[PDB]
Every structure is written in structure tokens, then in C-alpha cells.
Ligand binder design. Structure first.
Ligand SMILES: C[C@@H]1O[C@@H](O[C@H]2[C@H](O[C@H]3[C@H](O)[C@@H](O)[C@@H](O)O[C@@H]3CO)O[C@H](CO)[C@H](O)[C@@H]2O)[C@@H](O)[C@H](O)[C@@H]1O
Lengths: 308, 315
């Protein structure tokens, strides 16, 4: 029976599965009131991708498609409607059992990046800064179309292959609706999201979720926003490759310093693909960025973790 | 000996190790005249990273540092000097045996992306939070001001004033600014990491076929353009996921060449075979240039270690 394993990449060798960023710190927040139900970076321990999760680091919060219409904003900026395909360029089939095209953003906010185009008919090219408001009524990726806005007023071509490269957030002020745990309405506001990866939570008292946290760039304004993922992208890729059978619902993992061999703390790695620790405080976990998680053994829901 | 393995990823599940792009096609060009000596995506089969190669997909062609001041330059735009650190924020030690900070671009051109800043100082009235800004930027890697091995580079912006001196700065690559003649795009020309007229050091070695009839096989991605005409591409020797896998496994290399087969798993039939060389590159028996037309659900499978006398089946 294929033994379960995690990669031997250190924190400084891991990337976020919910936005294209390095992992900066491990992090807890026991008093979080939101339901944690992100859709990228979702993979079971036996290698089943869930939600909108796909394997490419370049596909996280990316879109591919074509522009079909230009509409000027009531105040400032220009909006462009974009039909979206699968990231591999094949048409998106709304009947497939996914919430949205794989790679679609899984949080409410104004996502800042670059739209680029390379024409079909050597080809002409253009690129501009762009913002995608995932809370907008026009954010309907499950129906095959989204809207982006630009500061550029005219030089975006219709009917030509278009790529969105995410870079960060446009703003986190009150009017920008940034909330990392609020899912977009993938089909628009009056329609239920479907085919979601399940919510995650600790089930044992005194435990809290452990996140891999990355700080996300901002186009302007004040803030130090972060995106927390349940497992880094390299873990998604590893679990998918190995497809090792899960022998219980909960694996015990140890965070180790290899310099010393000492265990710094232990955690539960749950079958659905998330970590819990026994910690009663919020904030970063102070540890070397050369530490890493090692699988110890399968345990069960009733195992008592050593406190952090 | 731990058996050598490759990951089981189709072309559509792989990314480029020289720029943050998906792999689009496999590609050959037997008549290439340049020396192929790229410095990102360099890893031996037993897991030794070489050149400027590092493991993060977000680190490829990225920079981290601080803007110092606005500077004058003959070229169009507004220009800024920035010191560069290691990507993990620690100071870059020029005495380390590397060509430049890991992740530094390994080709001549005008690299287009976004510079972003998050200030160190916070404002009590803003909830004790820092101010931020981001703007499009271009780094000309052929410029005499591109001196990452000395710990500083220059970038240009269309924005004329809203870049802050002394503040932490990140460069996120997106594509190229141009591939016109005056933009000096050449994927096989290395930057001068310490400036004009200095010799680059600590380089990963050049790669080439040894056997007649063989040519290099590349993983090709098409790179976006800010403007102008073109369909530029970046060719890597192995995808970033192979770098990551080889690094993890560190399997001993039992000869100088591994025989690999590109397989369609649906039929289990081999589409073609290739040599995977110890230093981390592929060759095939092909006498044409251009894409390899095969399913993007195909993948390479390790078959066996072979010796210097193996003749590959023509593709
Ligand atoms: C804090 C400063 O941010 C930028 O100022 C620009 C300003 O940014 C505003 C955002 O557009 C808005 O969404 C929200 O986040 O508030 C920001 C200001 O607090 O926008 C105007 C245009 O309306 C200008 O572009 C300002 O420069 C940044 O550019 C500054 O350098 C500051 O960091």
C-alpha cells in the first residue's frame, strides 16, 4: 500500500495555491468568523483535485478568452466584456461538474493584473493594466463571461486572444469588497454556486486551522493584505502525482528543523486537505523558513495534538 | 540506488522554467547558431541546481529590493535605480558562487512587468497600515545599468513620479515590452550580470547534442508583448516541475544519458524517444525545425539508463 508522503520543500521553497505568490509565513486565526471554503488549493490526501483547483502555478487566478464589448464606466475607467474558455483554450462546458473554469479566483475583491492580446491575423500585440471585480454582477465565469476594467480607454481589441496575468489587488478600502473567505457568485448573484469543495474546520476542541500565508501586492491605497491557503501549490502537485491511499481520516505531521532534527510542533493533516494545530492565539508562527512538514503516522479525530 | 524517475505530467500540466508561462509545445531547431547556455531551469539529473536556478515558479525573472532614486537615462521613459536582494529578502552576497541572485533573467531583452511597493513605515491614522503603489515597468537586461551581480538594476516606467525612494519593491514579470530590432531580444544571449565588459562567472555549462543527427528538444512557451508585432517564444531545457522533482528525489545518475519515451497513455504507445542527458537536457533524432505535433496529454517516461553509443529511433 503506497506510503503517504509530503514533499521535502521548505517554507521558502513553497508557493501559494490561491494566488501566484511565495509562501511568507505559517499563520493561525482561531477567532475567524467566516466559513472557510476556498476553491483553489483544494486536493484530498489521496490526490483528488476539488473546487476550481488545477495544477499550473500560472493558472491560479488566470483567465483566457476574447473581448466582445466595450462599455464606459459611469465615472472613471472602461469596462470590457470577455468570454472565457478553459485555460487550455478549449471551450468551457458549463455542464461539467466544476464551480467555474479551473483557475478562476475564489474570493471577493478587485484583482489587479495585466490583460495582454496577440492577434490571430507577424501578429499585432497590446497589453494594459486591468482590474477584475469578482463581486460584480458581471463576474459570471460559470456562464462563460466576465468583465474587466482598464485605465486605458480604447486600445483593447475585440475578437482576439486575450490573457489575464494576475499581479495583486487594486485596493482593500471599504468600497473594494476584499474578503478572502467570501466566494464569488460564479453564475451571478441570484444563482447558487455548485460543485464546491467542502468547507473546512477543526472538529477537536482547542484546535484551529493552520494556513500558509502570502502577502499580496496592492496597486494603491493603504493596507497589508494577505491570502491564506490550506496547502501550497507544490503539495497539490505532489498529492496528485502520488495518489497514495489515505489509511485514516487524519495524518499526524511534524514540523521539523533538519539542522537539529528537532520537532518544532505537530499538526493534524486532514483527509480533505487541510491542517489543524493546537494553538489558542492568532498570528504568524515564528519558525525557520528551512523547516518543513514530515508525515509521522495515521491517527484519528480523537488524537490530542501537543500544544504549540 | 534510488531509482530515477520523472513526474507524470502532461504538457498541459507543465510550466516554463525560464519565464512564468505554461508550456505550449515541444520544439526543435537543429540549425540554431547560438550557444545554448541558459541559466534558469538548470538542474542535473541527480538534483543539483545550477546557474541562477531556484525552485519557486514565482521567482523566475522576479526581483526584490528597494528603489533608491530616480535616475537619468537616454532612453524613453522615467528611470529608477533599485538595489536587489535575494528573493527571500536576505542581502545578496556577491562572493557566493552564483552568476547573479537566483531567479535573475537569463536572456537579453526588455522584460515587461509590474513594480509594486509596500512601505515600511505605517500610518497610525490608517490603522497602522502602510501605503502602496504599483506601475508597469520595463527592465532592459542588456543595459549597462543591469548589474544584478553587483546588487542593483534599473527599471523604467511610464508613470513619471509615483515610485517611492527607500521603500520595499517587488518586480512581477509579465512578458516583453517589444521585440523590435532596437529592443535586443535574444533568448540565447546572456546578460552581463556585473555590467558591460565584465565576464560572467559560475555559469551552468552550455548544452548540445553529441551524436550526429540529433538536436536539442525544448519545452516552448509563447511570451506576451506590451506592444508591437511579434510572436516571441522562450525555450527551456526542462520544465520547472522537472527541476522541482529532480531536486527532491536526488536519484543517483547511473550513466550519462537516460532513455526516455514520450507516451500517449490512452494507447500506451510510444510516440517518440529521446535522450535525457546528465546535465539536464533532451536530444532527439530529428532533422527539422518547428513544433512537435503530439497530444498535450502525452508525457515522458523513464525507460532505462543507456551509454554513449545508443542510436535513437528517428521521430
Ligand atoms: C496611498 C496612496 O495610494 C495611491 O494613491 C493613488 C490613489 O489610490 C487610491 C486608490 O485608487 C483607491 O482604490 C483606494 O485604495 O485609495 C487609494 C488612496 O488611498 O488613486 C489616485 C487616483 O484616484 C491616484 O492614482 C493616487 O496616486 C498611490 O498611488 C500613492 O503613492 C499612495 O501610496
Amino acid at each position: 500500500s503506497k506510503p503517504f508522503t509530503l514533499p521535502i520543500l521548505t517554507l521558502g521553497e513553497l508557493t501559494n495555491s490561491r494566488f501566484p505568490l511565495p509562501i511568507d509565513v505559517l499563520y493561525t486565526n482561531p477567532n475567524e468568523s467566516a466559513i472557510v471554503q476556498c476553491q483553489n488549493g483544494r486536493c484530498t490526501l489521496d490526490g483528488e483535485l476539488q473546487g476550481t483547483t488545477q495544477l499550473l502555478p500560472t493558472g491560479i487566478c488566470a483567465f483566457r478568452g476574447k473581448v466582445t464589448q466595450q462599455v464606459q464606466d459611469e465615472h472613471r475607467g472602461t469596462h470590457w466584456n470577455m468570454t472565457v474558455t478553459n485555460l487550455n483554450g478549449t471551450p468551457f462546458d458549463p455542464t461539467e461538474d466544476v464551480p467555474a473554469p479551473l483557475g478562476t479566483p475564489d474570493f471577493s475583491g478587485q484583482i489587479y493584473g495585466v490583460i495582454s492580446q496577440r492577434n490571430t491575423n507577424l501578429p499585432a500585440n497590446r497589453a494594459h493594466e486591468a482590474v477584475i471585480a469578482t463581486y460584480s454582477p458581471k463576474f459570471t465565469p460559470k456562464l462563460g463571461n466576465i468583465q474587466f476594467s482598464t485605465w486605458e480607454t480604447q486600445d483593447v481589441s475585440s475578437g482576439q486572444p486575450t490573457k489575464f496575468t494576475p499581479v495583486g489587488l487594486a485596493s482593500v478600502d471599504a468600497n473594494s469588497h476584499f474578503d478572502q473567505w467570501t466566494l464569488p457568485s460564479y453564475s451571478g448573484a441570484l444563482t447558487l454556486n455548485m460543485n464546491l469543495a467542502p468547507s473546512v474546520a477543526p472538529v477537536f476542541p482547542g484546535e484551529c486551522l493552520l494556513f500558509f500565508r502570502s502577502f499580496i501586492p496592492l496597486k494603491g491605497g493603504y493596507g497589508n493584505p494577505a491570502i491564506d491557503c490550506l496547502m501550497p501549490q507544490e503539495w497539490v502537485q505532489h498529492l496528485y502525482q502520488e495518489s497514495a491511499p489515505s489509511l485514516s481520516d487524519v495524518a499526524l505531521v511534524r514540523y521539523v528543523n533538519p539542522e537539529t532534527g528537532r520537532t518544532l510542533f505537530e499538526a493534524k493533516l486532514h483527509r480533505n486537505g487541510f491542517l489543524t494545530v493546537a494553538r489558542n492565539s492568532a498570528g504568524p508562527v515564528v519558525a525557520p523558513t528551512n523547516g518543513y512538514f514530515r508525515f509521522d503516522s495515521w491517527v484519528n479525530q480523537f488524537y490530542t495534538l501537543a500544544p504549540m
